[PDB]
Amino acid sequence: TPGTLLQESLLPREANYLAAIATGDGWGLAFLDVSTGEFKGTVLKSKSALYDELFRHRPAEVLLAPELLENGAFLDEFRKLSEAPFEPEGEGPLALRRARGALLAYAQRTQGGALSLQPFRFYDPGAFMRLPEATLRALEVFEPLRGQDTLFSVLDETRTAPGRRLLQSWLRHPLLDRGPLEARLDRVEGFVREGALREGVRRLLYRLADLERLATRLELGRASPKDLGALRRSLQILPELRALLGEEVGLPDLSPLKEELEAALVEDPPREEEVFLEVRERAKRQAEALREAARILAELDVYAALAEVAVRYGYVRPRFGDRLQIRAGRHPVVERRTEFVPNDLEMAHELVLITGPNMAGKSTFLRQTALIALLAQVGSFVPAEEAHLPLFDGIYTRIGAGKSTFMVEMEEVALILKEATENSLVLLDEVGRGTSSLDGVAIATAVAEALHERRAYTLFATHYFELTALGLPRLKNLHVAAREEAGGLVFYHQVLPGPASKSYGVEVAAMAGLPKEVVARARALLQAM
Template sequence: PRPFRPYDPGAFMHLPEATLRALEVFEPIRGQDTLFGVLDETRTAFGRRLLQSWLRHPLLEAGPLEARLDRVERFVREGALREGVRRLLFRLADLERLATRLEMGRASPRDLGSLRRSLEILPELRALLGEEVVLPDLGSLLEELRAALEEELPLKLSEGGLIRQGYDPHLDALRQAQREGVAYFLELEEREKARTGIPTLKVGYNAVFGYYLEVTRPYYERVPSEYKAIQTLKDRQRYTLPEIKERERELYRLEAQIRRREEEVFLEVRERARKEAEALREAARVLAELDVYAALAEVAVRYGYVRPRFGDRLHIRGGRHPVVERRTSFVPNDLEMAHELVLVTGPNMAGKSTYLRQTALIALLAQIGSFVPAEEATLPLFDRILTRIGASDDLAGGKSTFMVEMEEVALILKEATERSLVLLDEVGRGTSSLDGVAIATAVAEALHERRCYTLFATHYFELTALPLSRLKNLHVAAKEEEGGLTFYHQVLPGPASKSYGVEVARMAGLPKEVVERAKALLQVLTARREGVAEAVLERLISLDPNTLTPLEALRLLHELKALALGAPLDTIKG
């Protein structure tokens, strides 16, 4: 039985399924592109599976990560070595699956043929890489397979033609007897031609009658009396002889013995291979890592990635989204933060969500030991990446979009630590504006208190003025021009000046009269809000707090609250 290996979840970054979905690591939200699709330049099936495993289990310690990055960097620097290794890896069979099939006794003749061809490639890989790659010694198994198996092997064991001449003496003797039996029929044709004087006589075979003698119509009168007719055709007849049937039965017997002996020998060879299953699995593990290193190097060279460094602050210069940049021109952006709450404002479609996602993907790539899409990157080692991005619901479970959003935010607040990277996109938008602002503010304050690395994209400009010591404001640049709204996709310091929601609605194709009505209403609502703020401010300036009694101060607070909310005074409760 295979030995169990301990699995320690605490040794890896925690990536919830919601994070993997939001970042489109394996499954696209729309379109067909994923992070795995960009990275998957592997050349083997087991290398591809290992890359998937690494993406699900990023590392937490700098030492193993630096070791991975060293190996990737060597392949980045040595292009000829990378190409040579990838070319050889492409010729390998799936050694992991072969080992499993061997252990289960299900390996077919062609499986062993694939194993032989794969083992023949290992010395070439050793020659290319020298002592850097340590593979188990499978030379004796290779020699056994070379000696035992034919070059071309059938799909099924029952088809025969498996074992080479000279490998098994008993099988060789049976085959020799079979060859002599076939030679008898070749000699029979010449002998009977001479004896009967029938020049067109020939020996044939079919599955119904077995071996037979065939004579054409012009020579029927020369057919000897001992010939027994078995089939008449239009212009010829077929005959048999007692000795033909006897020889035929002997050939069938030999054929069955050969098939049985081949099967016995094949099973013996397969059993010898089964004993090396663990060594094969170890070879597959080493080769899978080699495949992933070479694949990550190929991606780094092809797309211009750089080696990340690890430190206490997050510093990304010229960062890019590894998936989005593959399908469109991309504007790189910078980010600098350390245990801060970074608010990102700007209009819809400007690129706020992409900016959040690219930061998380760069962190994820760094912690699997990959180069990253940036000009320069220094990153903390995050213990988890937590996201609330995009709208989703669970109608079958009776949950609205807002309910699902709040559940995900609750999980983030429960799990986030000061070593976590948290991405929030438009939290609170699924309810009323006042409720949304209140919830978003409370969530922002809670994450700020936890000191985690938080990127919070929002349209609530109230959040940009929160009195928090580690709050940083960024905005995605856009400009309203005569032709409409222009997105620069550039992230700049400070909050956005406005949200441009009406302009985005116009770009989305809303009817002109609806857009014009929205503009007019926006002006009225903005003026009303500014008027309320002005009225509250004037009321406060006119007051002398030193002359107020406690009861008068309490009444004044109720009055100011009603004024701010635009509600009648008698509806406000303390």
Template sequence: MGQQIDPLTSVESDIRAVLVDAPPLSVRDGGVIRSGYSAEIDELRQVAGSGKEWLTFIEQRERDRTGIRSLKVGFTRVFGYYIEVSRAQLDNVPADYIRKQTLANGERFITPELKKYEETIIGAEEKLKQLEYQAFVELRGRIVQVLTTLQKTAHQVAELDVWLSMAHIAVERGYVRPEVHEGTTLLIEGGRHPVVEASVGPGVFVPNDTRFDEKQSLLLITGPNMAGKSTYMRQVALIVLMAQIGSFVPANRAIIGLADRIFTRVGASDDLASGQSTFMVEMTEVAHILHHATERSLLILDEVGRGTSTYDGMAIAWSVAEAVHRMGARALFATHYHELVQLESTLERAACYNVAIRESDDTIVFLHQIRPGGVDKSYGIQVARLAGLPSSVIRRAHEILSTLEQGKKSTASTIGDAPSAEIALTEPVVSPMMLMESAVGGEVDQLALFYPNGEPVKKSGKTAVSERLVNQLTRLDINRMTPLEALTWIAKAQKKIKQGDGSWD
């Protein structure tokens, strides 16, 4: 490539001969043309630049001629050059001085000689700017004549810069040359995130492997927050992208089957300008992926369905995972819905992986290693402790979690294309009856989520109030209630519970 680049030495020589090494931002303010290029410009520059020395000479000469030691020669944009004499020395002013301005402490004068020099200086400065700009325009015109060659050279240099940059980084950070092929198999051994690795320093980032082949195209990744799921998925996308642009990649070995597109659904953001919530933005992006991805695409899906209720979110995530599997695209699917790990037994090319941690005395240490298999908990409370939540909040969260887990029940559902696919869905359940009996007194020992005085309410026998309240609650159409109507109904129910009133309108 270096031999194909036209160095344009004539253009370089012309620019160096005409322009100064550090020209000003504006070419119309002068100071652009190099000394020695134009004799006329050099002469005008000498005249315009000798003003200070000439004024010093005039000032000393007039002091000697008049005997006024305080005499000064100055310049203003309004009056131009002037001779200033203090009031005490006005009697010594020569006859050829012409009064121009009266001040509180003296007067300012001009002379024909001073005025003529002023015209010379000002004229020289204006003409100098004009000549410098004209010389610049002439240079620009000569360069335009070879514009096509110049643009070609610029493009070649830019391309060379890209290759040199990638080569430099590859050598500096130990990247390897990927094997790119037209199949769909993707194998990465010891893959690393190029940006994160650079920020944490050499030898700190934990490398991980990735495999997509005919046996697994959908990788379901579980693990706690902050464990590195998003980093892992993004590094896979970046390695594929780098390989397909011709770069070496941050890995020990990489076999990359070409991808026609890389789709991502990561992060959480809303679009207030168009009135779209976080969940709506997420669903719009997922819809775009499902409509446009092919079996040759690479999909990065991070916690699909988290922006809505638990069951709705899990149902959407489950359905999206199935759709991606049917499509045959290579997909990394991170989720906190642990029920989705059951897809490994129902979907032929689904495989579960988790981000390893080390747990000890209710604390966790992130190992940042991707391992086969799913997990059944997210360690959210432990992560909250690491984030600095108050210990009282952590203790209370443990109490609530323990009670919710005791009340967890499993239901079997048939979900999937195959009629025989039976999948167990598990989720903490707190039924309306449990909550009402906890609030008004019942037979079930169930957690009251909001204690009036910070203590559990005492349980007693089931009352008629609770039965009527539950009956009324089950008849509500909550999908048609506004938040205000729901709060009004709850306030009304609370009042009746306190009064022991079993009647309902």
């Protein structure tokens, strides 16, 4: 099972999951990974939120319950999966134990024996900043829309498979309370004001074994000799990392197990077998103290990883409050590929339209904001100079990109309207396009006011002038400019306050390469309107 694969030779530093979906008093979602022996599941009400939690954790193999399997209607939609029995195991919401055990009896059936599991955890997709599928896609968080990079690659500075698995979590699960975040930012600020200190741990952690996946294997009876080789090698760095931080990291004292191996082992692990397992046992007697390290280790890995990034790329420790101010911010993604003229932004539960022509930063400008928000609520310094962000509850989008673009996009907005709040952050772009004249400028206005009344931080970017002149108490207008210079125009990657004065359509159009008479007959009909 691509989901029960326990061999370290078929698993990326990232986590993997075997998922099961059972029904009954909510929607049962069980995620398990033989490798890390990670065991967590949950019950969702909204089929929307389900497929969503299912989307963040991207499992490679899904187990559907018999109700869904028979459900040819539900079956083909999920397809637009391996059979196993969902016998309610453990205690908890029906649809949970059904899918939960469904994994157990499926891993154990694809493990030749018993499994090594972690205390089943129960997570709630509500104690964390919301983050829909589309947003993740829109911000190019994990995967890139078109190109190569993503926020992950750019932040990917983790030195251990565990850390990377940890960091990835934090992204898939942003924070809400300031207390935790601060705690993280205080830490991250540590290895940055202690350059040498960060220099040490990073250099030491390099090559460090996967103490988490390793230990998992110890409790599974499959931890080969070589692994102890790496493990011994690891436990040996353990004392060093501990000597640069202090008896404060908490790091256990696994010298006993360390010293043992040193002797009992060949510098390069390929009656001897009777002696081999005797040492293992002595080691595996420290199964948790191992997982303990991994866990406590990954933190530093990341805390220092990011921090490294931050310093390497000039990331400013964010300050929370109730106002959004970005002193010369940047799109951390695109920033690492060319000169990037920064920008500024100030908001407060307002609706800020963004006009002017495209090709001048608008879209990228909307994203550039979401990320900073996200980057902040995840626990890193962001690409700016100064930056005051509020504590967003959610970050919904509606960017770029059976049915038609139109319907799709509507449904997008529908959700936003149906989840956005006075604290939600919303970014709209050309909402209500790909449709006839009036309807266009029509829809746009409703959605606006709609959000406007919601008093949610909304960076609505449009070409609809009408929208810009709608005297509402919380509106605000920013535009970006082009400039018909020596080439044909001269767009500036600057978002300047106040709406755009002229219209640049026919211009851009003309510029693009349109035949001169047409542009004329165009500018004319324009004037004449």
